Amino acid sequence: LQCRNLQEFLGGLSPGVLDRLYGHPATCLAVFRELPSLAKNWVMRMLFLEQPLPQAAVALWVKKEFSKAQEESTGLLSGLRIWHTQLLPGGLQGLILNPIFRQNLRIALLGGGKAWSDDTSQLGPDKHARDVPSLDKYAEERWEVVLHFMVGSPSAAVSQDLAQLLSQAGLMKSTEPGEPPCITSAGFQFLLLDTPAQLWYFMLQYLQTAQSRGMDLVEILSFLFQLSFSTLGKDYSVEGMSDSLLNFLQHLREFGLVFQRKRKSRRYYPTRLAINLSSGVSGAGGTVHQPGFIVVETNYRLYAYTESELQIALIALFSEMLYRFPNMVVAQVTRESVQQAIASGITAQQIIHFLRTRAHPVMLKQTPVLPPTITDQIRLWELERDRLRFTEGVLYNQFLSQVDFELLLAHARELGVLVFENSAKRLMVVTPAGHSDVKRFWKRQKHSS
C-alpha cells in the first residue's frame, strides 16, 4: 500500500478542492504537522505576513547546502496550493500563503470567527459510558469481523452494508447465484497486511465508492484526520455533524473505528482503531494491536500461544498445522503448504514480514530464526513460474527483407501486442486481438514497397 501521508491524495487535487479541505481549521493543523520542519517553520513565518515574499529572499534564508532540501519542500507546498505564486512588478516573483489555509491556521493559533469543528452544549456524565479497555477490545473484535468474512466463520457478523463495501473494495468477490463470498488473491494479501495499513487501504476504497454514494470526499477526509488525533479519554458529540458524516459514523461503527452506544445517541465514544488508523505499518517486528504470539524456527515449527479463529486461519494458509491446543498451536512450514498459499495468491515477502511482526521476544535479536531456509526454495519456485509465460500469439510469415519487418516491429511495440523484438528469426509475437491493426500496417508496407 502506497503511504499517502496527507500528500499523495492532496497532490493532483483541483486548487478549489484543496481550498475546501483547508476550509476546516482541524485539517490545516493536520497538514501543518504533515509538512516537513523546513516547510512548516516557513509557513509559520509567512502566517503573520500578508505581503508575498520573493524567490530570491526564499533562496537567501536557507544555507546553500540545505537549499536543495528546501526546494523539495517548496515543490510540495506549491502542489498542495499552500504557496501560490504572485507576479510582482519587479522581476522577482513573490510567494504568498493560501488565504483560506492561512486564516484557518490563524483560527487554530489565535481567537477566530469559526466556532470549531466539535461543539458540546453541556454534556458531562454519560449513561453506560464505554470503558477505555472495553473500547480497545471492541475495536479489535469489529476488525476481526470484517476479516472473518474471508474465513467463513460464524463470528463474521457483517451488517451487509460492510459486505457491499467489501465487494466494491474487491478484497472479497461474490460470484455465482446466491452471491456466495469468495477471497480474492488481493484479499489474501490484505489479510497478511498489518491492521493500521489495512484500515488505511479500506478508507481509500471507501473514498472511491463515496462519489457514487454522494458523500463529500473532503468531509470524510476531515473526519479521518479527527480519528487519527482522537483520544480515548476525550468524548465527542454526534450533534453538529452533517448527515453524510452521520452515515460515515454508522460505517465507522462497522469498521470499529468509532463506538456508538446508540445510533440516534448524541454522544459517540472514540475507539482504539481510529487512533491506530494511519498510512503506515505498525512495526517491522512488532504489532501495536497484538503482542507477538508466533514462535519462528529454522526447523519450520511454529508455536502460537494465543488462540483465535482468525489468527489460526492466517497461520494455516502459509503453514499447515500438525496439532491444535488452546495453550499452544503446532504448525509446520511445509513446501506444499507454502505452494498452496502461492496458488491462492500471496506475497513471499509478506509471509516473512508476518512471522517477524508476531515473532516471540526470545526469537527477536536472533539472526537465523527471522529468515527460514525455505525462502530460498520459494524463490526457486517463483523462478519456475517466471520461466514459463502464457499469452496468445498470432504468427506472421514471409517477412523477407528485415527493414520491412523492423517498420512493423515499431508499430507492434507501440500497440504493445508484440512480446519480443525477435528481429533475426522474423516471427511475429503480436497477439491475435491486435493482429488486425498490425495486418493493416503490414498491408500498407506492401503498398509502399
Binding site: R301, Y303, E320, L322, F325, N327, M328, V362
Partner: protein, 606 residues
C-alpha cells in the same frame, strides 16, 4: 492434517513450572530454554526414544522397548507416571498411563540366568514358565536329557535356541530379562583388570558405563557414542570395569588396531601377554585369554583346518565377557546371530552413533542386541570440544545441458555415472580445494563412486585411495597425511572400512549423494571431521561441503541428511551460488571440454 488433543488432556494452568506436553500418541515437546528441561530430558531418554532432536524444542515419542529398558532398571510404575504428571503442562491422558502400566507390570516377564556357562531360565511364578513351555516351537527347541531355589523354577535352554527364544518371546509378549551371576559361573576364573590412573577418562563415557552396570550385575544395553572420538576408550574402560576377559569385534581392520592401541597404554598386562586372533598372530592364546576378532569375517571354513578350528574353540573358552559391537549399521543383518552361535556372551554391548542400524525400517537387529540404554548428545560433545561443531554447506551446480539430454535418454546406471561426473560439480569441488588451499587447512574429498574420486584426483594431480588397493599402501598414504605434518588434498573411497588416526583432522567434500549406504555417509561426516584442538572454541575449523546436481533429484537425500543434522546439532546452510566459482581458473570450464567428458563416459561400458 490438524489433530486436536484438547479433549484427550484436561487443561490445567501449570505451564510455568512444566516443560513437557503429554499427548495420547506419546509425542512429547521439551522447551530447551526452561531450567526444568535438564531433569525432563534425562526422564525422556529413559522412557522414550526421540524421532528427532531439534535444538530449540526436543521431540520424544514413548516406545515400548525404551519403556521396557526403564522397567529393567527397576523404576516403579507409579514413580514413572508421577514424574510425567510433575512435568506435564496438561493432565496426562488415561490411555497413555494404561500403556505405561502394562509395560511396568513385571520387571521381567521371563528371566534368563547364566549358570556354569548354561542359559537356565528361572521364573518366580511356575505358571509363567508353563505358559512359555506351551508354545510348540519352544518344546521342539527345549533342552532335555542334558542354592536357595525357594519359589524358583529353572529349565536349561540351548545356547543355539537362545536367539530363537528371544523372537518367540516377542510373539508370546514375554520378553527375556538378561541376568549374569559370577558365583553361578564357578568354572570362569576371576582376573584383575585396572584402567591406568594417569590415563584421562571422558565424563560422558564414565556415566554411560555406570548406567550399563546399573544395580549389582551388569545389565545388557546399547550405548550411542561418537565414532573416532574416544569410541575405543569406552569399550576398553568397560572391559576393565567388568574385570573379566572380554572380546571386541570391529569390522574395520584399522579400527581393531585402534582399539588395541587404546588398550595397550592403560594396561601393562598386554606387554607381558598379547594375543590377537585378527592377522592370525595367535600369540599364547590360552595364556593371554583376551583376544581380538572381526565377527564371522575372521573365520574361514575349508580354507584352513587345524589352527582355524583351534582359534574358534579358544575364543569361546577363553572369553566369557559381554560381546562388544562397533559400526553395527555397517554390519549386515543376522551377522550378530551368527557371532552369537560361534561364541555366547551373557550381555550384549553396541557402540554406534547412528540412531538407526542398517537403514531398514522393516528389519531391525535392536531386539537381538537389546534396548539402547543411553544416547550421547552430539551438541554436548561440541560444547566439550571433543568433536568440532561441523558446518554443513550444500553447493548446488546446474546439470550440464549436453549431460542432461543423455541423462533423460537412458535409465541405465550410466545415467547415474553421468550425474556423478558433472563438470560444473567438479569445478565447484576444484574451487573448494582452491579455497581450502588459501586457508591452508587439511582437506579430504569423498566420492560415493569408487573410481569417481580417482578420476578427479588424476586431473588435479592429487593422491587417491580406493577400495581395490593394498592395505599397506593405503595405510602408508594415511600415515603421511596425519603422522607427517604436511597439507594436501586426498581423495578417499569408502574402502569397505572406516579409518581414523590419533592426529585430528577436519573438512570433507561429498561429490555425490547416490550412495546406497546412506548411514555410512552420515557416519563418515562425524568420523572424518574432528576438533583441530581439544576443548575447541566456538569458531570451527571444520567445513563440510555437499555438491548437488540440479534436476538429478539429489535434493531428496539432502532432506534426509537434515534430519540427521538436527540430532547432531551441526550448523546447516545452503549456498546455491559459490559467488566466485565462475570467477576462477578451473578445469572443464569450457563447454567443449564438458562435451569431451560426456563422450568419454558414453564410450565407457555401463
Amino acid at each position: 492434517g490438524a489433530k486436536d488433543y484438547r479433549l484427550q488432556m484436561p487443561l490445567k494452568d501449570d505451564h510455568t513450572s512444566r516443560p513437557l506436553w503429554v499427548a495420547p500418541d506419546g509425542h512429547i515437546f521439551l522447551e530447551a530454554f526452561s531450567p526444568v528441561y535438564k531433569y525432563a530430558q534425562d526422564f525422556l531418554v529413559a522412557i522414550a526414544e526421540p524421532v528427532c532432536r531439534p535444538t530449540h524444542v526436543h521431540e520424544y515419542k514413548l516406545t515400548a522397548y525404551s519403556l521396557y529398558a526403564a522397567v529393567s532398571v527397576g523404576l516403579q510404575t507409579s514413580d514413572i507416571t508421577e514424574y510425567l504428571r510433575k512435568l506435564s503442562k496438561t493432565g496426562v491422558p488415561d490411555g497413555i498411563m494404561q500403556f505405561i502400566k502394562l509395560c511396568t507390570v513385571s520387571y521381567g516377564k521371563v528371566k534368563l540366568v547364566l549358570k556354569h556357562n548354561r542359559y537356565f531360565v528361572e521364573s518366580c511364578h511356575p505358571d509363567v514358565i508353563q505358559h512359555l513351555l506351551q508354545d510348540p516351537v519352544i518344546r521342539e527347541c527345549r533342552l532335555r536329557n542334558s542354592e536357595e531355589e525357594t519359589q524358583t523354577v529353572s529349565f536349561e535352554v540351548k545356547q543355539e535356541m537362545i536367539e530363537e527364544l528371544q523372537k518367540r518371546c516377542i510373539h508370546l509378549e514375554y520378553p527375556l530379562l538378561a541376568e549374569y551371576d559370577f558365583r553361578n559361573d564357578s568354572v570362569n576364573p576371576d582376573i584383575n583388570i585396572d584402567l591406568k590412573p594417569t590415563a584421562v577418562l571422558r565424563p560422558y563415557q564414565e556415566k554411560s558405563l555406570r548406567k550399563m552396570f546399573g544395580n549389582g550385575r551388569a545389565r545388557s544395553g546399547v550405548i550411542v557414542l561418537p565414532c573416532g572420538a574416544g569410541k575405543s576408550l569406552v569399550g576398553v574402560t568397560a572391559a576393565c570395569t567388568v574385570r573379566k576377559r572380554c572380546l571386541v569385534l570391529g569390522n574395520s581392520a584399522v579400527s581393531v588396531e585402534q582399539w588395541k592401541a587404546q588398550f595397550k597404554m592403560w594396561s601393562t598386562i598386554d606387554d607381558s601377554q598379547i594375543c590377537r586372533f585378527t592377522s592370525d598372530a595367535k600369540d599364547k592364546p590360552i595364556g593371554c585369554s583376551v583376544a581380538i576378532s572381526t565377527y564371522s569375517m575372521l573365520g574361514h571354513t575349508t580354507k584352513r583346518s587345524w589352527e582355524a578350528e583351534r582359534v574358534m574353540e579358544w575364543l569361546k573358552t577363553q572369553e566369557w565377557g559381554l560381546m562388544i559391537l562397533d559400526e553395527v549399521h555397517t554390519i549386515p543383518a543376522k551377522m550378530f546371530r551368527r557371532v552369537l552361535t560361534i561364541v555366547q556372551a551373557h550381555c550384549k554391548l553396541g557402540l554406534t552413533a547412528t540412531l538407526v542400524r542398517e537403514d531398514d525400517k522393516i528389519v531391525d537387529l535392536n531386539f537381538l542386541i537389546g534396548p539402547k540404554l543411553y544416547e550421547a548428545n552430539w551438541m554436548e560433545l561440541q560444547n566439550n570440544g571433543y568433536i568440532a561443531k561441523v558446518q554443513c554447506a550444500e553447493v548446488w551446480c546446474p546439470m550440464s545441458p549436453e549431460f542432461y539430454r543423455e541423462y533423460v535418454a537412458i535409465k541405465t546406471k550410466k545415467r547415474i555415472l553421468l550425474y556423478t561426473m558433472n563438470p560444473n560439480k567438479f569445478r565447484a569441488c576444484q574451487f573448494l580445494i582452491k579455497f581450502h588451499e588459501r586457508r591452508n587447512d587439511k582437506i579430504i574429498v569423498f566420492a560415493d563412486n569408487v573410481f569417481a574420486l580417482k578420476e578427479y584426483a588424476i586431473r588435479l594431480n592429487k593422491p587417491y585411495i580406493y577400495g581395490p588397493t593394498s592395505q599397506g599402501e593405503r595405510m602408508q598414504i594415511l600415515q603421511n597425511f596425519k603422522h607427517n605434518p604436511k597439507i594436501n588434498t586426498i581423495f578417499i573411497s569408502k574402502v569397505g572400512d572406516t579409518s581414523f588416526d590419533l592426529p585430528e583432522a577436519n573438512v570433507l567434500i561429498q561429490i555425490s549423494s547416490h550412495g546406497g549406504s546412506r548411514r555410512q555417509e552420515a557416519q563418515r561426516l562425524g568420523r572424518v571431521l574432528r576438533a583441530k584442538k581439544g576443548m575447541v572454541a566456538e569458531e570451527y575449523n571444520a567445513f563440510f561441503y555437499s555438491l548437488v546436481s540440479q534436476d538429478t533429484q539429489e535434493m531428496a537425500y539432502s532432506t534426509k541428511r537434515q534430519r540427521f543434522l538436527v540430532d547432531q546439532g551441526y550448523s546447516f546452510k545452503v549456498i546455491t551460488k559459490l559467488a566466485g566459482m565462475e570467477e576462477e581458473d578451473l578445469a572443464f570450464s569450457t563447454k567443449e571440454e564438458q562435451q569431451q567428458l560426456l563422450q568419454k563416459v558414453l564410450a565407457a561400458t555401463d
